[PDB]
Write a protein that binds this ligand. Structure first.
Ligand code: CLA
Ligand code: CLA
Ligand code: CLA
Ligand code: CLA
Ligand code: CLA
Ligand code: CLA
Ligand code: CLA
Ligand SMILES: CCCCCCCCCCCCCCCC(=O)OC[C@H](COP(=O)(O)OC[C@@H](O)CO)OC(=O)CCCCCCCCCCCCCCC
Ligand SMILES: CC1=C(/C=C/C(C)=C/C=C/C(C)=C/C=C/C=C(C)/C=C/C=C(C)/C=C/C2=C(C)CCCC2(C)C)C(C)(C)CCC1
Ligand SMILES: CC1=C(/C=C/C(C)=C\C=C\C(C)=C\C=C\C=C(C)/C=C/C=C(C)/C=C/C2=C(C)CCCC2(C)C)C(C)(C)CCC1
Ligand SMILES: CC(C)=CCC/C(C)=C\CC/C(C)=C\CC/C(C)=C/CC1=C(C)C(=O)c2ccccc2C1=O
Ligand code: SF4
Ligand code: SF4
Lengths: 103, 39, 80, 773, 61, 148
């Protein structure tokens, strides 16, 4: 609904925490990390807890870009996944690429 | 260099305890002065 | 936002981009070293001021200097 | 099972004694700065940064445990040597009430022989001595020590046991050392710590109690002297000597095998509370105690399933099946993963065990003042204040360490692959709710206890004593706690809940003031050991202070545990470690965000907690329990007198001093902290002058901490830059570069000196007050 | 200034201002502003001892 | 007799606390067994106290009012034992330790040798610290090192 994924990305299985999005994600900005995994495996959330991601393309909305870039260094340092791309989602629905800005 | 006694806390601590014992027996031998006697 | 400057003492060791928790920096081609690259910050609106780039810079005094300036939502590091 | 052990991992050599800092990479390169020196000390017992091999880690832990049991046996030998050689125990065994216990004398050098107290001068010890507050003498009298040569024998045996634990450490590290799956059989270690360590330990102590300690205490309470029989009242050949003391059933142990247990009811009894002759628990109840909990601990060590070569043996539980059976709909997948957590993480185990032993030392501190275990100990008031205070401080220390190693598990040993939807993972999914509701209840407790105290200060200052939250004003009575007083006092008689108890649980519940003969120069009976302890409005207020301080120490340590790995501020905090100073001045500032800093802050908040606990104890026991029976008509006079509270009409009403003067902070300042510190500041030129010196030196160490606490290292480093310039000007050049302390070490040095200075201040105050009156 | 020569740092903002260092390698390119690599016996606050300085910031002793 | 200062030979209050201490010691020996190591220690303390009060008498210690000894440190040779002899004794032993440590740093210049003390370079440094002025004063007259 208010946190809809782009088409092609499927949600990882997470049971919901209290450390996630707050009212800023509705009114100022939120962020989206989108990566590609070869299997289903278990990763620590940057906001607390653990989640399971599936094979294919996985997207996650976070309040904060350092939460996304901390998730990205976790995927590199544990699961060798380097195709995370980080978007800044505005509340009107605009999406801009902010990592990799080089490509 | 010798084992375990060349180490700086050991050499240091035996220096402090030896100085305190030499100063202590100096206070016994001089009958615990406040000043140095002149006469 | 915080003000990040790169001086001419840089050696291109690639340790400030890796230690940066935000991807503020990037390497552009340069001629002043043997690595052929110098750090740059065109993403200073996204910097928190955490000074992990300055921790991992191996010179005498640091080629990267971040100056604490005006504070935003992004630079105070708020998830709210 | 089977104890799979490898042979000779580490050769014995002196090739690492000459190389300090061998054990991790940055210290192996050598001293460059002085920071290395402090990094030599702070990492020496962190075996997980030494080697990454969990096998070898468990071996270092095991050899460390043997060396610790060695150093505790060395300390046990040191007080047993001081009991045997330089004591008045040969005359303290005849007078436990008029002779102060001492085991140490100052030698006549430099003027310190005024520290020797004249009231410890007796036969065998004609020097004067330092009065002990440890209760070692009362323990020894309760366990049957009548002579100093058996104290010599125990001292030699404890030195031999220290040597045995050192040889066990050297054997189970360097020579013949077990692998990790031996440590992971938690089933058998629970079964052999319940049935074998606790169970057979208290059964062998029951054996000691019956054979030695109940008859020697019966000889000492019927009225003979130190000339006793250690050996010919023992064993088979003097079985009738067991019948001469408290009637050993019919004949021998043949009542034990035929099952008539009722004839053994004269040294295995269930009577009740305290003996009025000696002020302590009846020794027969203590023996039947240790036997019933011995039985029920060997029963507890028959619970968990262990499979091996024994045929029918192997029925029981695995812990893992129990944990994976307890699931629930609110808590997802429950306790699955906790077996793998507690069998692969040492820090999680140490967190649980430190919480439990700290909580148990706090329970010991309560249960030992209230029900006095050792003869004539409750009348020796510095022992009572010092044992309660000591076990409370050791308990608060191990509870802060519990929070520390739970945070350390969260940094290092937490694996997401183990914790899918268990209790541990779901606690991380609502850590904001836990910490914020804890923040609210700490705010509530602080307002609704300390603002009550502030309100009393304000109303008593304004000339409004009837406006006060007090027993004479707005009453706040402990009606659940008073109802539990009435229940635990009233449950002794016929047609009660427990119909075969003679003298109830404890006299603190509401029944009778107990007293004992004692000399005190040339006086009368006097000296209450124990009394009913009444709860009024001041007790409501002090216990809500206690709830506040416990809850805030919980808030600090539990916020360290749950936000060890990530937050909304620093999401990558687990890569920064347990122990880092900050993540820079940015994002507002991340000063003291690590979980180590939460242990650092919870240390002061534990200090706060336990200081108000022992302050409540000191003046509650002094104002309502301890004191004197007057020679005229059995009147109770406490150590601090009753206060006539002036009312708003003009008349007075008598309260005790606890009830009158801790409704506010002014009476805590005046009647507790100004008034009772008179013997620690006037103690010079006498036997308590060391406590005055320690009072002043501890004020010094406490204030000296505040340099390290309020400042930071960049000041100090550019100051050392000026000092290093002064050193290089005179060709005085350290190769080891002089540095300021690290930020984390400046916090650690400050919290260490703050804790040492405040606790030794209160220690000096407590002993110098309670030796006087 | 070549390999093995003892030099003194003239840079005002250095840790090792007025201190003797050892030249370890000199870069043979002309586009580098600070070619001369100098090791020191003393380490800085970052626990390192090697840095690239220029020719004009160094005095031959 | 200086300002708020009279010496021991005509001070009333010194005589008062001297008589108080010797009388307290007199009834402290007089109430105990002479063969229990307490009485021998208290007669040793009495002999020590008689010698220290006579030492305060003879070498002009100075009291007034409070009766206890006030020290004069302005540089008089009559009160030279107040400050001047422990000044020279301090400068000898402190220059010994400082020069021994400085000479140890000059001869080692090594990081293992600071945390592991080599006694063959430490105890000759201490022996030459015991003769430190003769090797310190020509290096004062020469000059140490040029650094800014
Ligand atoms: C930040 C913390 C810090 C720390 C941990 C240190 C630590 C140390 N410093 Mg130091 N320093 C610092 C800050 C610090 N410093 C600062 C801020 C400055 C000012 C710029 C200095 C300037 C400084 C200097 C100038 C020196 C040190 C030295 C030392 C080392 C002393 C070794 C020792 O004590 O054993 C002491 C060993 C002995 C005293 C040997 C004697 C033992 C004898 C031989 C045994 C036989 C005696 C026998 C038992 C009989 C006893 C009787 C007796 C009276 C003789 C030690 C490792 C000294 C050093 O380098 O090591 C020698 C040294 O010279 N430091
Ligand atoms: C018989 C005497 C003896 C000797 C010569 C050694 C010698 C040694 N032990 Mg050791 N050890 C001993 C008894 C001994 N131990 C006892 C009684 C225990 C039980 C407390 C231990 C438990 C132990 C552990 C856990 C470790 C050692 C280690 C070491 C090595 C490093 C020493 C060091 O740097 O610290 C200096 C100590 C002093 C100067 C004192 C070293 C070769 C380390 C090792 O073996 O490497 C893996 C190691 O971590 N020991
Ligand atoms: C009934 C047999 C028995 C007994 C008497 C003990 C006794 C002890 N064990 Mg042990 N243990 C046992 C079986 C037993 N264990 C088995 C079967 C296993 C493997 C499954 C273990 C594995 C084990 C470990 C890993 C450790 C102990 C430790 C200890 C000591 C704890 C210190 C203490 O309690 O204070 C009182 C002291 C005395 C009464 C003496 C203690 C002496 C700890 C220790 O401190 O190591 C030495 C510890 O590290 N035990
Ligand atoms: C570990 C504990 C322990 C140990 C080593 C002993 C040891 C002994 N007991 Mg004892 N006993 C114990 C606990 C213990 N007991 C407990 C818990 C009870 C109460 C249930 C008794 C009640 C008891 C009686 C009534 C007698 C013994 C006796 C004996 C002695 C001869 C053995 C025997 O009776 O057959 C022996 C030295 C006999 C004896 O010689 O009297 C001292 C005997 O008369 N015991
Ligand atoms: C069963 C008890 C137990 C055990 C086995 C451990 C074990 C460990 N702790 Mg821990 N801890 C405990 C209880 C325990 N702790 C308690 C009760 C507290 C609350 C105070 C803490 C709080 C704590 C913190 C905050 C940290 C640890 C850390 C560690 C690890 C390394 C410690 C080290 O290197 O040694 C080094 C020891 C020292 C440098 C000694 C420090 C100076 C002491 C405290 C002063 C002593 C004063 C003395 C008692 C009284 C004055 C005497 C004086 C005047 C002479 C190690 C795994 C550290 C770690 O990094 O974890 C992985 C860590 O930072 N612990
Ligand atoms: C005496 C000094 C002092 C005081 C008053 C406090 C007070 C507080 N601390 Mg603190 N703390 C202290 C020293 C102090 N601390 C020190 C030295 C350290 C260093 C180790 C810390 C470290 C520390 C930590 C790490 C934490 C606290 C927390 C708290 C809060 C606890 C919640 C509570 O008690 O409820 C209520 C508040 C009080 C009891 C304060 C007094 C309130 C008065 C009586 C009411 C005044 C009436 C009215 C408002 C006045 C209006 C006048 C008008 C003119 C303005 C509380 C506000 C914890 C927290 O935030 O939990 C919620 C927290 O985690 N403290
Ligand atoms: C070789 C040892 C040595 C020597 C010659 C000096 C000399 C000096 N110091 Mg220094 N210092 C030392 C060690 C030494 N220090 C150590 C170990 C520390 C850390 C505690 C310091 C901390 C220090 C500070 C903060 C200051 C000085 C200052 C000074 C200068 C003024 C005199 C003074 O204030 O004394 C002061 C001396 C101390 C405070 C340290 C106490 C003495 C130490 C313990 C002696 C070291 C013993 C050493 C181990 C002996 C080795 C024997 C060898 C044969 C094995 C002076 C040139 C002051 C200055 O800059 O003046 C302009 C200044 O403020 N020092
Ligand atoms: C509390 C009574 C209670 O335990 O309720 C029951 C409920 C969990 O019960 P479960 O049936 O899920 O328990 C099964 C296993 O987790 C325990 O064996 O606890 C909670 O609601 C979470 C605690 C929140 C605390 C709120 C404050
Ligand atoms: C104080 C101390 C000490 C000492 C100790 C001791 C003295 C010891 C001991 C000990 C002992 C002396 C122990 C014991 C024991 C025991 C036991 C463990 C038992 C048992 C048993 C059983 C098993 C039985 C069984 C049975 C039954 C039940 C049924 C019927 C039949 C029969 C009888 C068989 C020392 C100095 C070292 C050090 C410090 C501490
Ligand atoms: C110049 C000099 C000097 C001097 C110094 C000074 C001036 C000082 C001081 C100081 C002060 C001014 C103070 C103090 C203090 C301390 C304290 C206070 C401590 C301690 C400790 C301990 C050891 C502890 C113990 C304990 C515990 C463990 C807990 C409980 C309680 C008790 C106590 C038991 C000297 C002599 C070195 C020498 C020469 C040089
Ligand atoms: C045998 C034996 C005992 C030998 C002793 C070994 C020898 C010879 C010297 C050892 C030097 C000693 C004893 C202490 C140095 C500690 C030091 C440089 C403190 C300055 C400092 C202060 C005052 C702060 O407040 C502070 C606050 C926050 C962060 C950092 C700091 C900080 O860095
Ligand atoms: S201050 Fe922190 S966020 Fe900013 S560029 Fe440096 S490392 Fe990156
Ligand atoms: S600024 Fe520092 S960390 Fe970044 S490339 Fe240059 S030398 Fe390396």
């Amino acid at each position: 609904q208010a946190n809809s994924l782009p088409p092609g990305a499927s949600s990882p299985i997470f049971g919901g925490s209290t450390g996630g999005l707050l009212r800023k994600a509705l009114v100022e900005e939120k962020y989206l990390i989108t990566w590609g995994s070869k299997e289903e495996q278990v990763f620590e959330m940057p906001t607390g807890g653990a989640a399971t991601m599936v094979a294919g393309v996985n997207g996650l909305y976070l309040a904060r870009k350092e939460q996304c870039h901390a998730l990205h260094r976790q995927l590199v340092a544990k699961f060798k996944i380097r195709d995370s791309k980080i978007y800044r989602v505005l509340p009107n629905g605009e999406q801009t690429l902010i990592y990799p800005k080089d490509g | 260099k010798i084992p375990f006694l060349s180490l700086a806390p050991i050499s240091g601590a035996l220096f402090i305890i030896g100085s305190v014992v030499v100063l202590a027996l100096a206070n016994i031998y001089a009958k615990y002065p406040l000043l140095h006697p002149l006469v | 936002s915080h003000a990040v400057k790169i001086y001419d003492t840089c050696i291109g060791c690639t340790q400030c981009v890796r230690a940066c928790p935000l991807d503020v920096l990037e390497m552009v081609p340069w001629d002043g070293n043997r690595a052929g690259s110098i750090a740059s910050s065109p993403r200073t609106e996204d910097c928190v001021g955490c000074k992990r780039c300055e921790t991992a810079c191996p010179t005498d005094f640091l080629s990267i200097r971040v100056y604490l300036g005006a504070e935003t939502t992004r630079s105070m590091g708020l998830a709210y | 099972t089977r104890a799979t052990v490898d042979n000779n991992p580490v050769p014995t050599s002196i090739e690492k004694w000459g190389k300090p800092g061998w054990f991790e990479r940055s210290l192996a390169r050598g001293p460059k700065t002085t920071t290395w020196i402090w990094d030599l000390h702070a990492l020496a017992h962190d075996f997980e940064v030494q080697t990454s091999d969990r096998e070898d880690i468990a071996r270092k832990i095991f050899a460390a445990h043997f060396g610790h049991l060695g150093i505790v046996f060395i300390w046990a030998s040191i007080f047993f040597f001081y009991g045997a050689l330089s004591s008045n125990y040969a005359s303290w065994i005849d007078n436990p009430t008029g002779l102060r216990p001492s085991a140490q004398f100052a030698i006549p050098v430099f003027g310190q022989e005024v520290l020797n107290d004249p009231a410890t001068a007796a036969k065998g010890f004609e020097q004067g001595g330092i009065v002990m507050t440890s209760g070692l003498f009362h323990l020894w009298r309760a366990v049957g020590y009548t002579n100093q040569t058996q104290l010599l024998a125990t001292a030699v045996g404890a030195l031999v046991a220290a040597g045995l634990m050192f040889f066990g450490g050297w054997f189970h590290y360097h020579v013949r050392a077990p692998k990790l799956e031996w440590f992971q059989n938690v089933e058998s270690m629970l079964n052999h710590h319940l049935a074998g360590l606790l169970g057979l330990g208290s059964l062998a102590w029951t054996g000691h109690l019956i054979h030695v300690a109940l008859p020697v205490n019966q000889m000492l309470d019927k009225g003979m002297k130190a000339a006793d029989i250690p050996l010919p009242h023992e064993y088979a050949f003097s079985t009738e000597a067991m019948g001469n003391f408290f009637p050993s059933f019919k004949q021998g142990l043949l009542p034990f095998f035929t099952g008539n247990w009722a004839v053994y009811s004269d040294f295995l009894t269930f009577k009740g509370g305290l003996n009025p002759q000696t002020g302590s628990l009846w020794m027969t109840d203590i023996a039947h105690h240790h036997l019933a909990i011995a039985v029920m601990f060997i029963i507890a060590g028959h619970m968990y399933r262990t499979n091996g070569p024994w045929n029918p043996l192997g029925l029981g539980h695995s812990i893992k099946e129990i944990l994976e059976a307890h699931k629930g709909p609110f808590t997802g997948e429950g306790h699955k993963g906790l077996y793998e957590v507690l069998t692969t993480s040492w820090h999680a185990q140490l967190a649980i065990n430190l919480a439990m032993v700290g909580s148990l030392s706090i329970i010991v501190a309560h249960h030992m003042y209230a029900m006095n275990p050792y003869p004539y100990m409750g009348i020796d008031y510095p022992t009572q204040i010092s044992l309660f205070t000591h076990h409370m401080w050791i308990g608060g220390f191990l509870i802060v360490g519990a929070g520390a190693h739970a945070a350390i598990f969260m940094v290092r040993d937490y694996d997401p692959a183990v914790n899918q939807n268990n209790l541990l993972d779901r606690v991380l999914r609502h850590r904001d709710a836990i910490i914020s509701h804890l923040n609210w209840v700490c705010l509530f407790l602080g307002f609704h206890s300390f603002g009550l105290y502030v309100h009393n200060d304000t109303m008593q200052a304004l000339g409004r004593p009837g406006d006060m939250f007090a027993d004479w004003g707005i009453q706040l009575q402990p009606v659940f706690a008073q109802w539990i007083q009435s229940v635990n006092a009233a449950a002794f008689g016929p047609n009660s809940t427990a119909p075969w108890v003679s003298a109830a649980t404890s006299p603190v519940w509401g029944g009778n003031v107990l007293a004992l003969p004692a000399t005190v120069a040339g006086e009368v009976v006097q000296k209450i050991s124990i009394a009913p302890v009444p709860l009024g409005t001041a007790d409501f207020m002090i216990h809500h202070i206690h709830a506040l301080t416990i809850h805030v120490t919980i808030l600090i340590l539990l916020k360290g545990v749950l936000f060890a790995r990530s937050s909304r501020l620093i999401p990558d905090k687990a890569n920064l470690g347990f122990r880092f100073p900050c993540d820079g001045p940015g994002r507002g500032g991340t000063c003291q965000s690590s979980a180590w800093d939460h242990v650092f802050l919870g240390l002061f908040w534990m200090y706060n907690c336990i200081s108000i606990v022992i302050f409540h104890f000191s003046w509650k026991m002094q104002s309502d329990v301890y004191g004197t029976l007057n020679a005229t008509t059995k009147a109770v006079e406490h150590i601090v007198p009753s206060t006539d509270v002036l009312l708003g009409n003009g008349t007075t009403q008598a309260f005790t001093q606890f009830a009158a003067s801790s409704v506010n902070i002014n009476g805590w300042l005046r009647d507790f902290l100004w008034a009772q510190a008179a013997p620690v500041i006037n103690s010079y030129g006498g036997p308590s002058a060391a406590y005055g010196l320690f009072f002043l030196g501890a004020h010094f160490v406490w204030a000296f901490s505040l340099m390290f606490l309020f400042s930071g290292r960049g000041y100090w480093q550019e100051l050392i830059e000026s000092i290093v310039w002064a050193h290089n000007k005179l060709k005085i050049v350290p190769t080891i570069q002089p540095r300021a302390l690290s930020i984390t070490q400046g916090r650690a040095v400050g919290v260490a000196h703050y804790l040492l200075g405040g606790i030794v201040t209160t220690w000096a105050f407590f002993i110098a007050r309670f030796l006087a009156i | 200034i070549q390999k093995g020569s003892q030099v003194r740092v003239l840079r005002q903002e250095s840790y090792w201002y007025n201190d003797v260092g050892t030249v370890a390698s000199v870069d043979k390119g002309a586009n580098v502003i600070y070619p001369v690599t100098v090791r020191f016996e003393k380490v800085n606050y970052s626990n390192l001892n090697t840095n690239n300085f220029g020719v004009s910031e160094l005095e031959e002793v | 007799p200086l300002g708020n200062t009279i010496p021991c030979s005509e001070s009333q209050a010194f005589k008062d606390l001297k008589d108080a201490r010797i009388n307290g010691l007199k009834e402290k020996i007089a109430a105990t067994d002479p063969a229990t190591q307490y009485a021998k220690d208290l007669t040793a303390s009495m002999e020590l106290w008689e010698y220290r009060y006579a030492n305060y008498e003879k070498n002009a210690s100075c009291d007034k009012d409070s009766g206890q000894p006030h020290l004069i440190v302005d540089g008089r040779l009559s009160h030279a034992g107040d400050f001047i002899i422990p000044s020279i004794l301090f400068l000898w032993l402190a220059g010994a330790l400082g020069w021994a440590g400085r000479d140890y740093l000059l001869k080692t210049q090594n990081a293992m040798d600071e945390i592991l003390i080599d006694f063959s370079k430490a105890v000759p440094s201490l022996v030459l610290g015991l003769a430190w002025p003769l090797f310190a004063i020509p290096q004062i007259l020469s000059g140490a090192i040029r650094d800014n």
